[PDB]
Amino acid sequence: MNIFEMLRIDEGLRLKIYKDTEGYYEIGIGHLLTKSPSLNAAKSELDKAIGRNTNGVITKDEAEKLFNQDVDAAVRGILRNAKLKPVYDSLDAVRRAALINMVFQMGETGVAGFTNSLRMLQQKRWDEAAVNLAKSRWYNQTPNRAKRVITTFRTGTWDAYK
Amino acid sequence: AXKX
């Protein structure tokens, strides 16, 4: 159990371009293609990522690859961000994965926006961060996922994934 | 997704 395994549970694996619960197009393991409604712009984003004509279908290996780069970018994003970095540094290993998970799903700037929730995590007020984490658009968008991540931060265990 |  780590970020790689946690994300696999949260995102699934699809070798064909798909729509998320918001109508956006993703592929592989949560790799965002485009928020534009056209399936063709999505195919286009795709061939540019891969470097080939894909017709909206990729190999599993290509999926794995993308995933690695994505997890790597989520970590880079936490490390260069002045608001997230001091938080991250302060967390144990389990909670760290919970933050990389939000970042992979919302981006550095989107997570950097959870001002109250980050103040609480930074101060080790786990119950109160969980409550603040729930008052968000994120949670109203993807509550089941958000609920598993918030339990991780609350508890510091892999309980919601087990 | 996405604090609002």
Side-chain angles (χ1 to χ4, degrees), chain A, chain B residues 1-2 4:
Chain A
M1 202 90 46
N2 59 50
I3 185 73
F4 293 103
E5 297 277 289
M6 188 193 199
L7 282 177
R8 273 183 215 266
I9 286 163
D10 284 338
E11 310 290 350
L13 182 73
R14 297 178 265 179
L15 301 176
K16 227 166 292 288
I17 295 176
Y18 70 94
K19 255 197 173 10
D20 55 31
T21 48
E22 290 286 308
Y24 309 133
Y25 283 115
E26 308 186 337
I27 200 185
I29 302 150
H31 176 82
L32 183 57
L33 302 169
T34 182
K35 293 219 248 167
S36 118
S38 166
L39 174 57
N40 293 332
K43 297 208 166 160
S44 225
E45 291 319 298
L46 183 58
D47 300 343
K48 281 171 318 184
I50 291 329
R52 91 190 167 66
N53 216 320
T54 66
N55 221 78
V57 190
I58 54 162
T59 60
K60 162 149 159 145
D61 268 356
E62 281 160 337
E64 288 303 338
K65 198 23 217 132
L66 274 168
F67 183 55
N68 276 351
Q69 306 185 148
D70 294 331
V71 169
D72 176 85
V75 175
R76 284 216 264 54
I78 281 149
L79 303 180
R80 57 176 181 227
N81 189 288
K83 286 143 278 193
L84 296 184
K85 194 195 186 229
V87 173
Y88 186 73
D89 288 346
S90 81
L91 303 173
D92 54 274
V94 187
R95 309 173 165 95
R96 271 171 193 234
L99 192 65
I100 296 175
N101 188 306
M102 285 185 74
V103 175
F104 181 93
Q105 203 188 350
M106 295 175 270
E108 49 201 273
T109 78
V111 175
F114 281 66
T115 285
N116 298 316
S117 300
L118 305 157
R119 276 188 17 147
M120 298 294 84
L121 297 166
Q122 168 93 89
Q123 299 185 45
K124 333 203 149 264
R125 288 126 147 86
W126 320 122
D127 297 280
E128 307 150 274
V131 167
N132 287 280
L133 289 162
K135 300 195 346 223
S136 62
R137 176 155 107 115
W138 169 48
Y139 179 86
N140 285 89
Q141 295 156 327
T142 72
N144 283 322
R145 150 106 171 246
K147 303 169 190 126
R148 286 206 288 289
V149 171
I150 305 188
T151 298
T152 310
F153 269 127
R154 189 161 57 75
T155 61
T157 78
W158 293 106
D159 275 351
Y161 290 86
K162 250 75 130 305

